Amino acid sequence: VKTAETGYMSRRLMKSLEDLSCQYDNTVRTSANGIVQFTYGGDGLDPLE
Amino acid sequence: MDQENERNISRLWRAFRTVKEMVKDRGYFITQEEVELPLEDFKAKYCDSMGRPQRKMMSFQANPTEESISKFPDMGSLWVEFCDEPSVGVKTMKTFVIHIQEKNFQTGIFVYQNNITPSAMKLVPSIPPATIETFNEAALVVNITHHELVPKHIRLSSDEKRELLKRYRLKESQLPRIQRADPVALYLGLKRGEVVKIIRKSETSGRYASYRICM
Amino acid sequence: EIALFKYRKARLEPGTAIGAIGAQSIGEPGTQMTLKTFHFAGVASMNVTLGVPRIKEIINASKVISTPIINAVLVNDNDERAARVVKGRVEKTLLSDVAFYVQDVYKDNLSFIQVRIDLGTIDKLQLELTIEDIAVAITRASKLKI
Amino acid sequence: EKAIPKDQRATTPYMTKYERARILGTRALQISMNAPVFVDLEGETDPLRIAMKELAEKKIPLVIRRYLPDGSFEDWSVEELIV
Amino acid sequence: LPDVVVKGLPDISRAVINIRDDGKRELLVEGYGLRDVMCTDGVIGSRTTTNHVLEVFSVLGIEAARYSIIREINYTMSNHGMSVDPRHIQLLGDVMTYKGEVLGITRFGLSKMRDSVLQLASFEKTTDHLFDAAFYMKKDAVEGVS
Amino acid sequence: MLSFCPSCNNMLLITSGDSGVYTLACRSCPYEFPIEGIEIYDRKKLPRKEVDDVLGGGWDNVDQTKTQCPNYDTCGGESAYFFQLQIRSADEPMTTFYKCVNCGHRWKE
Amino acid sequence: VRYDNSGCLVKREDLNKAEYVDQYDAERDFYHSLREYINGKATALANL
DNA sequence: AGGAGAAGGAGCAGAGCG
DNA sequence: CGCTCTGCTCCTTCTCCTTTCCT
Ligand SMILES: CCC[C@@H](C)[C@H]1CC[C@H]2[C@@H]3[C@H](O)C[C@@H]4C[C@H](O)CC[C@]4(C)[C@H]3C[C@H](O)[C@]12C
Ligand SMILES: [Mg+2]
Ligand SMILES: [Zn+2]
Ligand SMILES: [Zn+2]
C-alpha cells in the first residue's frame, strides 16, 4: 500500500529540487539564476566527504 | 468585571511596552526607563480616577536619533495613536488621516483595538508624501522579535544594499524575497526594495548571514 | 597538515547536482517508513502522526493537518494551583461542564429557560469566572445564534 | 562577457571530478579520431586509457573555461589544476 | 444552550499537563489557537511553538517557518531511525520558503518560480499548461534540465 | 417539552394564539390545556466534569532487549525498547526498531 | 578580514557583534577548534 | 475514493442618501 | 431613517491524480 505513495513523493520531490547547482562563486542557485542559498548549509561543506 | 478590567489593563500595558520597544529598535529615540515602565506606574499615569484605562493619554511622538538620521537621512517623526472605539470606521480613520496631514508627519501608526472595516482600509494608502501603518492590539502582546524562533533581522541602508549587490554581482530581482505585510517585515516597517540582513544560527554551522529583499 | 588537507578537501565542488542529491537523500529513506504511526505498546501517550503522512503534510504545505499540537512553556513548577490555573484558561465549551442542570419553564405570559450554574465545580477546577462572565458569554452566544 | 585576468582569479585551484571526467572524455574522443599523442604508448590501443596515461603524466593540451553566474569567466589549464 | 464556550479559546480541543524528563510540569495544547496561547497569562510567550508550519508562518514570519520546517523534518526522520545529513533538509526548507511564502511540493506550489511551461507540462496538468502558454504567449527559455 | 395529546398522542405545543395565551396546543385534534396555576417545567440533568490527570508516559512495562547504542561513547546503553512490527517483504526477514533506554535514540536493524 | 556591511574594516572591538557575521565564520570556528584541541594536549602534558 | 482549487451564488454589516 | 447599493465572508458544486516495471 505504501509503495505508491512513496514513489509519488519521490517523483514530486525530484520535480521541485531537480535543478539546483553549486556555482563557481559558491552560491546555490536555480536555472533562472535565482540565488536560493548563499552557501551550502551555511557551511559550504559536502556531506559525503 | 474587576478581574476583567485588570486583565484589560495588563494587556494594554504589555501592548504599550511592545509598541515602545518596536519604535525603539526601528531607530527612534526612546529610553530604557521609558520602556521599562512598571505596571503600577502605567496604571497611575495613563488611567483616570474612576478605575478604567484611557487610550488618549498614550498617543505619543518619536524623533529620529542622531546615528539613525546619519544613516537614513530621509526619515521623519512618527505618531503612535491608540484608539478607544472598538470597531474603527471611516469617520475615525478620516479624522486620523486629517490629523496626520495637518501635523505634517512623515509616518504614523494606528493601534486599533477590536476590528478594522474594509472601507477604512481603503483610506490607509491615500497620502502622496506619507504613509500610515495600521496595527492590531491583540497582535502586540508579545513582540515577535524576542521569540526564540525568530532570527535577528537587520535593515540595510541604500549604501549597504548597493555594497551587497556589488559583491555578488547580483540584481535585486534575484535575492530571496520577504513578503510585504510579513509579521517581522511590518514590525520594522519595510518598504518595497529594502534589503534585510538576517543572522540565522544552525547547530551544525554556528552563525551565518543570509539576506532578503522586500517584495 | 592532515587536518588542513582534510578541511580543504571537504567542500562542495562547483557543478554538483546538489538539488537532486538532496531530493533523493530525502525520498529514499522515505520509502521505508510505514504509512502508520507505529509505536511501542504500553505508553498510550498523546496521539501525533509522525510517518510518511506527516512528511506528506509538511511537504504539501497543507493548510489543515491532523493532530496539531501547541507546546506552551510555563513559568512555575507546582501541580496544585500553578499548572491548573493556566490550563483552565485554554479550554473548550464549559457551559454544560459547569451548568449542573438546565430548565425549561413556562408561565401565564412568560417563557423561561433557567440554568443553575453551581459554584463548587468552579471552586474545584480553578477558573476565573463567577456570574457576569457567564452572562456576557451567553449574550454573545445569543447574538451569534438567535 | 569579459575574462577575469590571470593575476586576479578567485576560483579554486583544485580540479573537480566533473572537470576530470570531461577532460578524459574529450581527449579520448580526440585520440579515437586519430590525433597525435604525447606519451610513450607501450602496448595499448584504447583512446580512453591513452588519455588516462596522458593525464597522469600531465601532458593534455586543453584548458578549462569556468563560467560565473554573472557571465564573466576564467581560464585554467590542466597543468595548473591539481588533484 | 449548553454548548457555548464560557472561558478559554473556542479553537482548541483540550490541554494536558505533562511531566518532563527534567521534572518540570508543562502542558501542551491540541488545537489551532497559537497567538492566544502565546498571549495568555502564566506562559512564556517567547518559548512557545506549534506543529503547524503554516501557523508559525502567519504569526511569526517566514524565517520562523523555515526553522519550523527544518526541525519538523529532522524530528520526523530522526524518530524513525533514518540518518540523513542536516544540510539536505536545510536545502529543502530553503527551497520551500525561498520566495517569501510557504510554497509546497504539489503541482499548485510548483508554479512558484519554475516559469517553465515544458517542465510544468512534463510534470502535471499538461494540456492546461500548454494552452495557457499558447494564450498568454508564455516565452520560456530552455535552461532547465527537463 | 415532549408531551403528547391525550386521545391522539400526537404532540403538544405552545401557541402564540389570541389574547396572549401560551396554552398547550395540539394542532391535530381539538384539545387544549390552560397553563394558569403553573407548575410545568422540564428538568435535564447534566454531568459537569472531572479533574483530569497528567500524561507523563510509562516507559516501564515496555518491551526491552539487550543491545548497544550507536553513540556508546556518549551514553552507555545496555538496553533498548523494541518492536518487531516492520516487514518489508515475505522472502526478506523481519525488521526490528529500537530506542536507547538511556538516551532515547531510535534506530532499526 | 571581516570587513564591514558597507566595506569598511571592523575596529577589533566589534568583532563578535552578531551583525558583521559573514562567510569565513565557519572557517574561523574550525581554526579555533583546532587550536583548542592542541591546547588540550599541551595542557595535559604540562600538568603531568 | 481523498484532496485541494476554483468558479458562482447568498446572506449581511457597512456607508450614503433624501 | 429605512432605504438601497457596494462589498465582503461563507458556502456548495465540479473536476484532476495518484509506483519499479519485465522483456
Ligand atoms: C477548527 C477548524 C478551524 C480551521 C478551519 C481554521 C482555524 C485556524 C485556521 C488557520 C489560522 O488562521 C492560521 C493560518 C492562516 C493562513 O492564512 C492559512 C493557514 C492557517 C493555518 C489557517 C487555516 C484554517 O483557516 C484554520 C486551521
Ligand atoms: Mg527477496
Ligand atoms: Zn390532539
Ligand atoms: Zn544511547
Cβ partners under 8 Å of residue B96, min gap 6: B81, B108, B110, B132
Interface list for F 1-30 with C (CB within 8 A): 1, 14, 20, 22
B161 shares a domain with B128: no
B153 shares a domain with B84: no
B111 shares a domain with B36: yes
Overall domain count for chain D? 1
Assign 3-state DSSP to chain D and report helix, strand, coil percentages, each to 5: 30, 15, 55
CB E84 within 8 A of CB C108: no
- Cα angle B153, A42, A40; round to 5: 130
B125 shares a domain with B68: yes
Nucleotide in closest CA–C1' contact with B117: H14
B62 forms beta bridges with: B78
B152 shares a domain with B114: no
User: Which triple of cell numbers denotes residue A10?
Assistant: 519521490
Provide DSSP, chain F.
Answer: -----TTT-S--EE---STT---EE-SSSS------S---EEEEE--------------TTS-EE----TTTTTS----EEEEEEE-S-SSS--EEEEEETTT--EEE-
CB D13 within 8 A of CB D80: yes
Residue of C58, C60, C64, C65 to test ligand 1 pocket, by largest number of atoms within 8 Å of CB:
C64
User: Which triple of cell numbers denotes residue E91?
Assistant: 536545502
Host domain of residue B182 = 143-215
B200 shares a domain with B107: no
B157 Cα distance to chain centroid:
18
User: Which triple of cell numbers denotes residue E53?
Assistant: 508550519
Q: Are the Cβ atoms of A9 and C52 closer than 8 angstroms?
A: yes
Give the CATH number for residue B43: 3.40.1340.10
3-state secondary structure (DSSP) of residue C18: helix
In the residue annotation, F92 being an active-site residue is answered as: yes
Distance B116 CA to H12 C1' (A): 17
* Method of determination used here: cryo-EM
B179 shares a domain with B159: yes
User: Which triple of cell numbers denotes residue F63?
Assistant: 518491551
B186 shares a domain with B110: no
Which of A22, A23, A24, A37 is the best substitution to test chain D (most D C-beta atoms within 10 A)?
A: A24
F8 is in an annotated binding site: yes
Closest CA to E29 of E51, E46, E7: E51
Smallest Cβ–Cβ distance between E80 and the set F54, F56, F106 belongs to: F106
B108 shares a domain with B158: no
Host domain of residue D77 = 1-83
Residues in chain B: 215
* Smallest CA separation from ligand 1 atom 18, residue: C63
Overall domain count for chain B? 2
3-state secondary structure (DSSP) of residue A37: strand
CB E63 within 8 A of CB B184: yes
B125 shares a domain with B154: no
CA distances in angstroms from B190 to B151, B153, E26, F39, listed in the order given: 16, 11, 37, 69
CB E63 within 8 A of CB B153: yes
Give the CATH number for residue D46: 3.90.940.10
Our CA-based measurement puts residue B198 at a distance from the nearest CA of chain D, in whole angstroms, of 23
Closest CA to A7 of B119, F67, B48, C28: C28
F75 is in an annotated binding site: yes
**What phi and psi values does residue E18 have, to the nearest 5 degrees?**
-115, 140
**What phi and psi values does residue E82 have, to the nearest 5 degrees?**
-85, 130
Our CA-based measurement puts residue C5 at a distance from the nearest CA of chain F, in whole angstroms, of 27
Interface list for F 17-46 with E (CB within 8 A): 46
CB A23 within 8 A of CB C14: yes
Residue of B nearest to G18 (CA): B199
d(CA B52, CA C36): 55
Ligand 1 shell residues, CB under 6 Å: C 63-64; E 11, 32, 52, 54-55, 58
**What phi and psi values does residue E25 have, to the nearest 5 degrees?**
-120, 95
Q: Are the Cβ atoms of A16 and E87 closer than 8 angstroms?
A: no
CB B88 within 8 A of CB B120: yes
d(CA E115, CA A32): 9
Smallest Cβ–Cβ distance between F46 and the set E2, E17, E25 belongs to: E2
d(CA C92, CA C84): 14
Protein-proximal positions, strand I, CB < 7 A: 7-9, 16-20
What ligand has the least distance to the C-alpha of F90? 2
The chain A residues in contact with chain B (CB within 8 A) are 25, 27, 33-39, 41-43
d(CA D71, CA C92): 61
CB D39 within 8 A of CB D19: no
B168 shares a domain with B101: no
Smallest Cβ–Cβ distance between E60 and the set B149, B178, B215 belongs to: B149
Task: Tell me how crowded residue B78 is: count the other CB atoms within 10 A of its CB.
Answer: 24
